[PDB]
Amino acid sequence: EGLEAYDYHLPPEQIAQEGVEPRDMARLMVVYREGPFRVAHKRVRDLPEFLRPGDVLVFNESKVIPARLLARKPTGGKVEILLVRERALLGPARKAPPGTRLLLLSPKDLAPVPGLQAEVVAVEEDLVAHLEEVGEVPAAPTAGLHFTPELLERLREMGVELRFLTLHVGPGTFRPMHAEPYAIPEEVAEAVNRAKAEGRRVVAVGTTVVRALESAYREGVGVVAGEGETRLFIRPPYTFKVVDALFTNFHLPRSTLLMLVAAFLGRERTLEAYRLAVAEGYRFYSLGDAMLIL
Numbered sequence: 001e002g003l004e005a006y007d008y009h010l011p012p013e014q015i016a017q018e019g020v021e022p023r024d025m026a027r028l029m030v031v032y033r034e035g036p037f038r039v040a041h042k043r044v045r046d047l048p049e050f051l052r053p054g055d056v057l058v059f060n061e062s063k064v065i066p067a068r069l070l071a072r073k074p075t076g077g078k079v080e081i082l083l084v085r086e087r088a089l090l091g092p093a094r095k096a097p098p099g100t101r102l103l104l105l106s107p108k109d110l111a112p113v114p115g116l117q118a119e120v121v122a123v124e125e126d127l128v129a130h131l132e133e134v135g136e137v138p139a140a141p142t143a144g145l146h147f148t149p150e151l152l153e154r155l156r157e158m159g160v161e162l163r164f165l166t167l168h169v170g171p172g173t174f175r176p177m178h179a180e181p182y183a184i185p186e187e188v189a190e191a192v193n194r195a196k197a198e199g200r201r202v203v204a205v206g207t208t209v210v211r212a213l214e215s216a217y218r219e220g221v222g223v224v225a226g227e228g229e230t231r232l233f234i235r236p237p238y239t240f241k242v243v244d245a246l247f248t249n250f251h252l253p254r255s256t257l258l259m260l261v262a263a264f265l266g267r268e269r270t271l272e273a274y275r276l277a278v279a280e281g282y283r284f285y286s287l288g289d290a291m292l293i294l
Contacts, residue, residue, distance in 0.1 A: 003254045006262060008274050010253050016287035019141070024151045027282055027289040029250075031273045033265055039273065041280065044146045044290055047247070053159030054200040055245075056191055059144050060208045061164045063183070065172030066091075067138050071101035072112065081118070081128070083171040085139075091128050096120075103130070106138060136174055141286035143206035143248050161195075163188045167208050177256065179231040182212040189216070189225035192242060196222060201244040207260050210234070213242040238263040246293045250277055250284040265293050 020026045023044070030040040030050055042049070051057070069081035069091075079101055080093035103116030115132030152162060165188050168181040192202050192213065204210045215230030216223045223242055233256065246264055251257035262270040273291070282289045 005267065006255075006258050006271070007253050008271055008278065010278060010284060014278065014281070014283055014288075015252075015285045016283040016289075019145065019287040022148055022150075023146050024148045026146050028292055029273065029277055029280075029282060029289070030292045030294065031265065031269070032294050033269075037269060037272060039276065045151055047151065047292065048154050048158055048160070050292060050294060051155065051158070051160050051203065052201075054161075054195070054198075055203055056161040056163060056195045056200060057155065057203045057205060057247075058163045058165060058188065058192065058209050058213065059147075059205045060142075060167045060182075060212065061144075062169045063166045064170035065168050067171030067174070069138060070104045070106065070110070071118070072104050073099055073101050085170055086126060088130055088134060088171070089128065090126065103132075103135065105135070134174075136176060138171070138174070142208065143290060145286075146247075146290050147205075161191060163191050165209060165212050167212070177231045177233050179229055180208065180211055180215075181227070181229045182208075182215075183227045184212065184216055184223065184225055186225040189223045193222035196242070202242055203245040203247065204243045205247045207246075207248055207257055210240075210243050210246060210248075210260065210264075214240060217241045233259075234263050235259040236263045236267050240264060246291075248291055248293075249286065250274065250282060250288055250291060252285065261291075261293070 026044050028042040028044045028046060030042060032038055064085055067083035069083055071079045071081050073079060077096060079096050082091050082093045084090045098120035100119040102112040105111050105113050113135055117132060118128050118130035120127060121129045155162060166183040173181050195202055211230050213223055215232055216228050218224050248261060
C-alpha cells in the first residue's frame with residue numbers, strides 16, 4: 001500500500017501541454033462528497049449552475065516579495081539590489097550605469113560573498129545578470145487560471161462573493177513539506193467567518209487557498225486575518241474546518257495534492273473519479289481541466 005493507495009494510470013498524452021481558449025472552456029467534472037457516486041461532465045464556464053447567491057468563492061493572488069540586497073562595484077561604489085523575480089534577473093535600485101557588482105554579506109561581515117557577482121544587462125525586460133550561488137538569508141499555472149473576466153462577472157451577477165487571500169512568493173520568501181507563506185486580508189477573514197456563522201458555503205479555488213484557510217483557522221474564533229505560514233500535510237484522515245467545496249485541477253498520481261483532494265472527497269471515491277476522468281478523456285495537470293467537489 002502506502003503511496004500505491006493514491007496511484008492510478010495516467011496516459012502521458014492526457015497531461016495538457018497547452019491550455020484551452022477561452023480558458024473557461026476547459027472541462028469541469030463535478031463530483032459530490034456525500035450521497036451516491038455521481039458526476040456531471042461540464043465546462044468551467046458552467047460553474048454558476050453549481051453555485052448559489054451567498055456562496056463565498058475564495059481565490060489566491062500571488063504577491064511578490066522582493067529581496068533587499070547590498071552590493072558594491074569592484075571599484076568601490078555601493079548599490080542596492082531589490083531582487084524582484086525571474087530566477088534572480090529582474091531588479092532595480094540606485095544609479096550606476098550597466099556595470100558589475102559584488103554581492104555583500106548582510107550580517108556576516110558585510111564582506112563580498114565569495115563568487116557572488118552580477119552585471120547590469122538590459123533594461124525593463126524579462127535588469128541584471130548574476131553569477132554563482134545566491135544567498136539564502138537576506139509564474140506558474142494554477143486552478144485560478146481557468147477563470148475569465150466574463151466568468152467572474154457572471155458570478156458577481158448571481159451574488160457569488162469573490163474573495164482573495166494572498167500567497168507570498170519571490171526572493172523575499174526564500175529560506176533554504178514546502179512551507180507556504182500567506183496573508184489573509186481582514187475583509188476576507190471577516191467574510192469567511194460571517195458566511196460560516198450564517199451557514200453559507202465557503203468555496204475554495206485551488207489547494208493553496210485550502211491550505212491557507214485551514215491553517216488560519218483557530219478554534220472558538222474561526223479564520224484569523226493576517227500573515228501566516230503552513231507546512232501542514234493535509235491527507236486522509238482530515239476534517240476540514242473552513243472549506244465546504246473545492247474547485248481544483250486534476251493532480252498527478254501519488255502526488256501530495258491528490259492526497260489533499262482524497263482527504264476532502266474520500267480516497268476511494270477520489271480514485272474512482274480520477275479513473276473516470278482518465279476514461280472520459282479529461283486533460284490533467286496545470287494546463288488541464290478542473291474538478292469541482294461539492
